[PDB]
From Swiss-Prot, chains A, B:
Signal peptide: none annotated. Keywords: Lectin, Mannose-binding. Mixed specificity lectin with anti-HIV activity. Binds to HIV envelope glycoproteins, including exterior membrane glycoprotein gp120, and inhibits viral entry into cells. Binding to gp120 is dependent on gp120 being glycosylated, and is inhibited by mannose, glucose and N-acetylglucosamine. This is Griffithsin. It comes from the Eukaryota. The lineage of its organism: Eukaryota, Rhodophyta, Florideophyceae, Rhodymeniophycidae, Ceramiales. It comes from Griffithsia sp. (strain Q66D336). Belongs to the jacalin lectin family. The keyword 4Fe-4S does not apply. InterPro entries: Jacalin-like_lectin_dom (IPR001229), Jacalin-like_lectin_dom_sf (IPR036404). SUPFAM superfamilies: Mannose-binding lectins. Residues 2-120 form the Jacalin-type lectin domain.
């Protein structure tokens, strides 16, 4: 099942492959843009890009969803916030006191689902 | 601890926030470049970029390491290969029959450690 392994030694500053997030949104999420890579369709309006600093990660996140993704927001361990973007359909679900490791998902003409991998503290 | 949750509904094509990989390497790994975002120093030579197709993910991976990262290669579930890049110090460790979810790590003037998060089948 889901696991992790470290390789290598002590030094340096932390980084994550989850380096920046933006979305396209209207009433719902048309796309999520991860590290500048577009996932979803061309609809809605493009949000600003949120870029994580070294050692900064998502610690609280709310995803509103039903059959598809309606809304997203998150806060980092340094107190910064992204969103909300999207609308008010579906129901809110919240991850709190976490460290988000990755955001995978499925998308076509819009953003259908998100797979969040995270440490729960 | 480490976990995952899905939000949303059925449709669309799979995607991952781990979308492409390149490295800078010489005798060792000077940098890893994830989704075009540079992690590490300016030394060595830049490899080509490997870009995952939808539904394509790392299924086997070898990381050679000691105090730092010496070498990396991987194969995908579609049979494509990246690397090896780097040199022959340290010792080889292999993840096999997996699905890599994320590559985090620590880097400074070069690539010091990698945190691989993955499903073990």
């Amino acid at each position: 099942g889901l696991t992790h392994r470290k390789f290598g030694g002590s030094g340096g500053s932390p980084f994550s492959g989850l380096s920046s997030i933006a979305v396209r949104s209207g009433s719902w999420l048309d796309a999520i843009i991860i590290d500048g890579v577009h996932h979803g369709g061309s609809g809605g309006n493009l949000s600003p890009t949120f870029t994580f600093g070294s050692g900064e990660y998502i610690s609280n996140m709310t995803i509103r969803s039903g059959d598809w993704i309606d809304n997203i927001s998150f806060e980092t361990n340094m107190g910064r916030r992204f969103g909300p973007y999207g609308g008010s359909g579906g129901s809110a679900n919240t991850l709190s006191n976490v460290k988000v490791i990755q955001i995978n998902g499925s998308a076509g003409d819009w953003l259908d689902s998100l797979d969040i991998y995270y440490e729960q503290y």
